[PDB]
Amino acid sequence: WRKLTAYITGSSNRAIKADAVGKVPPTAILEQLRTLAPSEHELFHHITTDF
Amino acid sequence: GFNLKVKDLNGSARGLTQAFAIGELKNQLSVGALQLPLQFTRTFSASMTSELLWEVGKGNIDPVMYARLFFQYAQAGGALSVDELVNQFTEYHQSTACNPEIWRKLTAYITGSSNRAIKADAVGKVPPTAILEQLRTLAPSEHELFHHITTDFVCHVLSPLGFILPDAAYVYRVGRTATYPNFYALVDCVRASDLRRMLTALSSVDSKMLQATFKAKGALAPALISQHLANAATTAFERSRGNFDANAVVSSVLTILGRLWSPSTPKELDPSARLRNTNGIDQLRSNLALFIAYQDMVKQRGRAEVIFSDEELSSTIIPWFIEAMSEVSPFKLRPINETTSYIGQTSAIDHMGQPSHVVVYEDWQFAKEITAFTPVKLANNSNQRFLDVEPGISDRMSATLAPIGNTFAVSAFVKNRTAVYEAVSQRGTVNSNGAEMTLGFPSVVERDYALDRDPMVAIAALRTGIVDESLEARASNDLKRSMFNYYAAVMHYAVAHNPEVVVSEHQGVAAEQGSLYLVWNVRTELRIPVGYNAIEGGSIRTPEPLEAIAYNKPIQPSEVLQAKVLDLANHTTSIHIWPWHEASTEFAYEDAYSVTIRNKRYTAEVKEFELLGLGQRRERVRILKPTVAHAIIQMWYSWFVEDDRTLAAARRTSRDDAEKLAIDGRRMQNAVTLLRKIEMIGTTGIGASAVHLAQSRIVDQMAGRGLIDDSSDLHVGINRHRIRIWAGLAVLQMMGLLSRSEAEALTKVLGDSNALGMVVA
Amino acid sequence: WRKLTAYITGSSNRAIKADAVGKVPPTAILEQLRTLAPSEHELFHHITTDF
Amino acid sequence: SVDSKMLQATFKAKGALAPALISQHLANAATTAFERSRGNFDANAVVSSVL
């Protein structure tokens, strides 16, 4: 997640309530995650997608 | 409970007595006579039924809990004195106080936006815990919960800003306990009251309270407040030390008071000049509970010296540190009469008309509450556990559990236990010794096996008297301690029924007194022999003790002694409870039923989950254990078990028919009744679950294999019952209860009569 | 006879009161009583018991 | 469904959430998601059993 969080905002881990302001994914992270490669077979990605 | 032949304990339970209590040891032992009367109204006892599940951690300060909870470590002897408890705190805290750093690091956590401008932004916040767990990481609550100390402490400062939210919300299960505390207990409870005073003091304030270094629009420069706080804590340190040493004082007081019960201590001319300061004195005394400590000193302090120097006259102020004036402990001012009453008396007689195989018992009440929960490790072995209810399921079971309690009519057990015991003067008329009087007190017993604990050879050591020590001292103390209560409870009754005494002591000793102590004034039962303790011609008063409690007409109780129900479940398992690993056991038991069908033996093995009827779920349930009943049954059980010995013996000692014959039924019927229970408890769901399961599996074994000529084989009693019973007993075995071994002795009931099982149902 | 009885229920000399006297299927007992009896044909004897 | 749906407040406006932190909740939130594991019993036998 933390890595992802870097993606969640490149504004990443600093304060306050992580700014407590702003967002939006819209996917894309997914494809990052594809990169990292964890859906040993795919669509475990989906599992993560909705989740 | 405990049986005694009433003529001695001066050779048979100097593991008991006031003299003994003096540690004045060995003698039938006089009471000269000699003085002045008493009673109370009250008790102040803990809370006889106490044992509670306390929701634990949260908000701002409930000092009471905190301390009271503290009191639990202290109590836990796992924390000795309060002093020990405190040094730690300071040790972390001062270790804390001296560094603004600690905070600073935290501040990095407070916002990762950390130390830069302006009033640290002067905008935004929110914790909600979590920091805590960081702090756990850093590791400063040398033992925990110094963490709590820090928990409430920072948060408030935060407040206004951030937002909290934790799993401070907890429950701690405080368990089974005494009623009567004891000396240091007092003292430390008072130190805990000091701790209340602390608690109101350190805790509370030192940061509450306030600057302005928050004030909107601003917030606070970062690093800076740390300095305030760190030092703010220094002040929190500096106030240090509650009342004076309670120990001496209380004792001082006690003896002071001691010095009041008198005779005859005209030192000052008794409570006197010092008395004249007083006018609050008044109540102290007036509860029996209050006395009770004294004795403790007598042994403890060997019976100390010089009324504790009065704490040098501390005018009117140290009682005002008490719990009645610093309410630390459950100690419950409770009216003597109600102090207990689940006990009624019961008795024998040979047509005597007096009794001599006599039972006064305590009556419980026990019923449902059953819970099989999966402890949830929601963390890596952390106290942070939800204990997850497998709802309905246990509960399906609970209902089957339900018929039982009632059916197991324990109150009647004891009724029975007498009813049985004696037969007429058959075995009599055969007494002029210490007649039996038997005391039906599950409670301790319950407690000990509920405490795992197996004192009973030490209890026996009490039995002889001389009760002594060589191992796990903690336990030993406990072992001892527990004992105290007993007599303690007793007098209540003693008093209850005869609430009249004169306090008189034994000389022949140093420090110089021997407990003004008590006597009662029985005369109830008439011309009666029972030890040198009397007779008291015509008229009767009488000094000591048990017997007197024998000396009434038996009765029922009026206290239920219903077991308490507990929670860390509803609402609370969203949050945890701490240690209970023990408090639960993993679910299970599997065994196999063997029967020989047309001369070929068949055997099928069976298991729990499915015994519920449920393949074969998660497998991760620990179960709230059966604290009560396992024991109560082991009473029941045991009660049964001795009896056969006696009974067999009784037959042996029967050397005519009539007696033997009397034994017969007396022997018999009732067993099958046991059986009546057991098959009956087969008529339940759960019995049936076995049964259904059972036959079927068999059925195939013959039919499925060959010969099918057999349903019948289920349907003669013998076997039927056999399985049923066995099964029924089996249930118990996953109810823990028995041992297969122990059942086996019940199986020894098989030889007998060998009648058995004609007809049903 | 009495004697026999006397035990059968139930142990005699105080013998009084609402107790709990779960007498039984008496069944066997009788045969003791038979023993004490003589043993004439079948049982009449038993009836009598029932009586 | 669930294991994160479902919920804290570590979002609640004006706030949002400290960064890294929620991860811990979630990661572990997933652990619970793990722990429940195993549906009905083995269908195979059973169905056949039934059959």
Between CA B382 and CA B390, with CA B385 as vertex, the angle to 5 degrees is: 150
Distance CA B275, CA B259 (A): 11
What count of CB pairs under 8 Å joins A to D?
34
* Residue for token pair 């001599």: B356
- Residue B129 and residue B164 in contact, taking contact as beta carbons nearer than 8 Å: yes
Surface-to-core class of residue B275, CB atoms within 10 Å of its CB (0-12 exposed, 13-18 middle, 19+ buried): middle
Helices (H) and strands (E) in chain D, counts: 2, 0
User: Which has the closest alpha carbon to B159: B208, B107, B123?
Assistant: B208
The residues, any chain, with a CB within 8 Å of residue D4's CB and separated by 6 or more, are A51, D26, D29, D30, D33
ω into D7 cis (within 30 of 0): yes
Please tell me the distance in Å from B248's CA to the nearest CA on chain D: 52
Distance CA B525, CA B535 (A): 11
Copy the structure tokens of residue B406: 């009632």
Question: Tell me, what DSSP letter sits at residue B563?
Answer: P
Please check whether residue C28 touches B, CB under 8 A.
yes
Q: Which helix (H) or strand (E) holds B593?
A: strand B591-597
Among C10, C14, C25, select the one facing B351 at the smallest CB separation.
C14
Beta bridge partners of B502: B37
- Residue B482 and residue B499 in contact, taking contact as beta carbons nearer than 8 Å: no
Please check whether residue C12 touches B, CB under 8 A.
yes
Chains that touch C (3 or more CB pairs under 8 A): B
Chains C and A touch (3+ CB pairs under 8 A): no
Structure's resolution in angstroms:
7.5
User: Torsion over CA of B106, B108, B110 and B114, rounded to 10 degrees?
Assistant: 140
Distance CA D10, CA B163 (A): 10
Helices B63-75 & B183-191 angle (0-180, nearest 10)? 150
Distance CA C46, CA B308 (A): 84
Question: Tell me, what DSSP letter sits at residue B607?
Answer: -
Distance CA C28, CA C4 (A): 13
- Residue B336 and residue B288 in contact, taking contact as beta carbons nearer than 8 Å: yes
Please check whether residue C16 touches B, CB under 8 A.
no
- Residue B384 and residue B378 in contact, taking contact as beta carbons nearer than 8 Å: yes
Distance CA A6, CA A1 (A): 8
Residues in chain A with CB shorter than 8 Å from the CB of D15 are 17, 20
Distance CA B546, CA B32 (A): 19
Q: Which helix (H) or strand (E) holds B7?
A: none
Copy the structure tokens of residue A5: 């969080």
Please check whether residue B430 touches C, CB under 8 A.
no
Give the method used: cryo-EM
User: Which has the closest alpha carbon to B288: B508, B40, B72, B478?
Assistant: B40
Distance CA B3, CA B1 (A): 7
Number of Cβ within 10 Å of residue B632's Cβ equals 22
Buried-state track C21-30, b at ≥16 Cβ within 10 A, e below 16: eeebeeeebb
Beta bridge partners of B586: B622
- Residue C48 and residue C37 in contact, taking contact as beta carbons nearer than 8 Å: no
Distances (CA, A) of B570 to A41, B171, B236, B246, B573: 41, 11, 38, 41, 7
Among B126, B615, B617, select the one facing D15 at the smallest CB separation.
B126
**Phi, psi angle pair for B375, to nearest 5°:** -75, 145
Helix (H, G, I), strand (E, B) or coil at B452: coil
Question: Tell me, what DSSP letter sits at residue B377?
Answer: E
Question: Cβ of D19 and A14 within 8 Å?
Answer: yes
Q: Terminal CA-to-CA distance of chain C, rounded, Å?
A: 15
ω into A26 cis (within 30 of 0): yes
**Phi, psi angle pair for B489, to nearest 5°:** -60, -35
Strands B357-362 and B435-440: parallel
Residues in chain D with CB shorter than 8 Å from the CB of A38 are none
Distance CA B347, CA B392 (A): 44
Distance CA B710, CA B723 (A): 16
Question: Cβ of D28 and B615 within 8 Å?
Answer: no
* Residue for token pair 């992270």: A29
With CA atoms as reference, the chain D residue closest to B109 would be D18
Beta bridge partners of B593: B604
The residues, any chain, with a CB within 8 Å of residue B761's CB and separated by 6 or more, are B679
Please tell me the distance in Å from B349's CA to the nearest CA on chain C: 11
Please tell me the distance in Å from B619's CA to the nearest CA on chain A: 26
Chains that touch B (3 or more CB pairs under 8 A): A, C, D
User: Which has the closest alpha carbon to B194: B67, B332, B75?
Assistant: B67
Number of Cβ within 10 Å of residue B478's Cβ equals 17
Helix (H, G, I), strand (E, B) or coil at B400: helix
The beta strand positions in B598-673, using DSSP E, are 600-606, 622-624
Please check whether residue A19 touches B, CB under 8 A.
yes
Among D9, D36, D37, select the one facing B165 at the smallest CB separation.
D9
Distance CA B498, CA B543 (A): 12
Distance CA B242, CA B193 (A): 8
Question: Cβ of A20 and D20 within 8 Å?
Answer: no
Among C4, C8, C14, select the one facing B665 at the smallest CB separation.
C8
Distance CA B324, CA B327 (A): 5
Distance CA B563, CA B366 (A): 6
Chains B and A touch (3+ CB pairs under 8 A): yes
